[PDB]
Amino acid sequence: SLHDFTLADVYRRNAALFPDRTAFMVDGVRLTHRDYLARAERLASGLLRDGVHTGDRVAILSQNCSEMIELIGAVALIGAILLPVNYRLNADEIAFVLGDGAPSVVVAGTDYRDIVAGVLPSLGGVKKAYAIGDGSGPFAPFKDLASDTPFSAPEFGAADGFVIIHTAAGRPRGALISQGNLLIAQSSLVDAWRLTEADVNLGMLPLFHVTGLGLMLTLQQAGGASVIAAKFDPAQAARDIEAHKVTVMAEFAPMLGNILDQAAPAQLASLRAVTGLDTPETIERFEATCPNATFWATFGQSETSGLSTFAPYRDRPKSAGRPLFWRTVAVVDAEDRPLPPGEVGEIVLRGPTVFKGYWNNAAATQHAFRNGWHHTGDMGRFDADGYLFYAGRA
């Protein structure tokens, strides 16, 4: 414990150093660092009250909202494991994810109270269930979760599981990622983007996804702010960028293209750094429109706690960037021998950004970790300067 720094320590840090600064702008309401810690502490006492211990799962099926954001914090404060369910899955897949994760507490969103109610009798040690809105069905209302019992934090470390992120393999496979994985991975983003408490993220990606969750947690570790909305609208995005002076964002095609369509260049003047998956055409268009902004080429996955390689796109167009500090990246042949510059092989990783392993799946983990390298399942090549070029799936 003495040598640990966790997300709990970030929330307390932000409440101490930047208490009155914005943490979140979410559905028309402002939440400061001081008030975020207070709300998270209340919900954390409630989870403890409900009988959640360190290592237990807390599930949420919900679109991005203030309740989800403060629940993320509450889970972090007691060393529990978040199970954010992908709401673009069908009722069978959701049932699988929930059963695979085995939560002690389930939280249903406004639009998802039905689907969750169907799954709930098939779940074992689920102690309490909540809904955001009101408790129509087997759920209590979410406001019942919070407790006034003064919060006393259980014992846990940064290496303990924090989140299970399922991505479809076949069956969905849950990637267990620690608090420390994320903090250390994201410290490199803070550095590359010169993030400070003045910075502002436009959180348009879902918080169940590694990039969405990761970008929020990144700005939070800088003491900065995220603008979070439930749904993506290109024109609303452009207005948010101007209104809140958004400096950074992550995006997947066609989001940036669609914002560029709907935005006057003058609305986007505060943008400094953008990343994600996009075409050379859109990236070059974006950089043309916004001369003071840089698009950042990247490769990563949930198993690598988000970003692994990163660089300004202009430094090496069509690449995925250079390996970040904390990451040793190689490209190997079928028997894990490192290949020379130019040759295509499997992208492999070592270091503290490698995830803990696959939930409920010793076989998949053993395969991922063969010969002491994490295996991405992705193909690529390095150039002479150590830039990675993504070459597809294996």
- Provide the binding-site residues for a copy of itself, judged by CB under 8 A: 1-5, 9, 12-13, 16-17, 158, 184, 187, 190-191, 194, 221, 322-323, 325-328, 350-352, 354, 369, 372-374, 385-386
**What DSSP assignment string belongs to 297-315?**
EEEEEGGGTEEEEEEEGGG
First to last CA, the chain: 40
H/E/C letters for each residue in 14-28?
Answer: HHHHCCCCEEEEECC
In the complex with a copy of itself, the residue whose CB is nearer, 252 or 325, is: 325
Q: How far is the CB of 350 from a copy of itself (least distance, A)?
A: 6
Decide which of a copy of itself, Cl ion, none touches 285; Cβ closer than 5 to 8 Å per partner kind.
Answer: none
Q: Which does 187 bind (CB under 5 to 8 A by kind): Cl ion, a copy of itself, none?
A: a copy of itself
Report CA torsion sign: 188, 191, 192, 193. Answer: positive
- 17, interface contact from Cl ion, a copy of itself, none, CB < 5-8 Å by kind: a copy of itself
CA distances from 192 to 144, 203, 304, 309, 343 (A): 41, 19, 17, 11, 28
Separation of CA 20 from chain center: 25
| 295-354 positions binding Cl ion, by CB under 5 A | 323, 329
CB 47 to Cl ion: min, Å = 25
Residue 11 binds: one of a copy of itself, Cl ion, none (C-beta under 5 to 8 A by kind): none
The Cα 159–Cα 60 span in angstroms is: 22
Residue 277 forms beta bridges with which residues? 252
Q: How far is the CB of 233 from a copy of itself (least distance, A)?
A: 34
Q: Helix or strand or coil: residue 286? A: helix
Q: Which residue has the tokens 């099926």?
A: 61
- Report, in Å, the least distance between residue 71 CB and Cl ion: 24
Q: Are strands 161-168 and 294-301 parallel, antiparallel or unpaired?
A: unpaired
Q: Which does 326 bind (CB under 5 to 8 A by kind): a copy of itself, Cl ion, none?
A: a copy of itself
If the CB atoms of residues 64 and 309 are measured against a copy of itself, the closer one turns out to be 309
Nearer to a copy of itself, 146 or 348 (CB): 348
- Hey, CA dihedral for 219, 206, 214, 130, is it positive or negative? positive
> How far is 391 from 380, CA to CA, in rounded Å?
5
Rounded least distance, CB 36 to a copy of itself, Å: 17
> Given the complex with Cl ion, which of 79 and 323 has the nearer CB atom?
323
**HSE-CB for 261 with a 13 A CA cutoff:** 9
Q: Which residue number has the CB closest to Cl ion?
A: 323
The closest of 353, 349, 369 to 361, measured between CA atoms, is 369
Choose the one of Cl ion, a copy of itself, none that binds residue 136, judging by a C-beta under 5 to 8 angstroms depending on kind.
none
Q: Which residue has the tokens 């003058």?
A: 266
| Residue type at position 6 | T
Closest distance of CB 155 from a copy of itself, Å:
10
Cβ nearer to Cl ion, comparing 74 with 329: 329
Phi, psi values for residue 374, rounded to 5°? -75, 130
Query: Side chain identity at 131, as an amino acid letter?
Result: A
Nearer to a copy of itself, 11 or 130 (CB): 11
The site for Cl ion, by CB under 5 A, has a size of 2
Whole-number minimum distance, CB 279 to a copy of itself, in Å? 27
Nearer to Cl ion, 23 or 116 (CB): 23
374 touches, from Cl ion, a copy of itself, none (C-beta below 5 to 8 Å by class): a copy of itself
Nearest CA among 160, 191, 167 for reference residue 301: 167
Asked if 78 is part of the footprint of Cl ion (rule: CB under 5 A), the reply reads no
Residue 150: name its binding partner from a copy of itself, Cl ion, none (Cβ under 5 to 8 Å by kind).
none
Give the residues lining the site for Cl ion (CB under 5 A).
323, 329
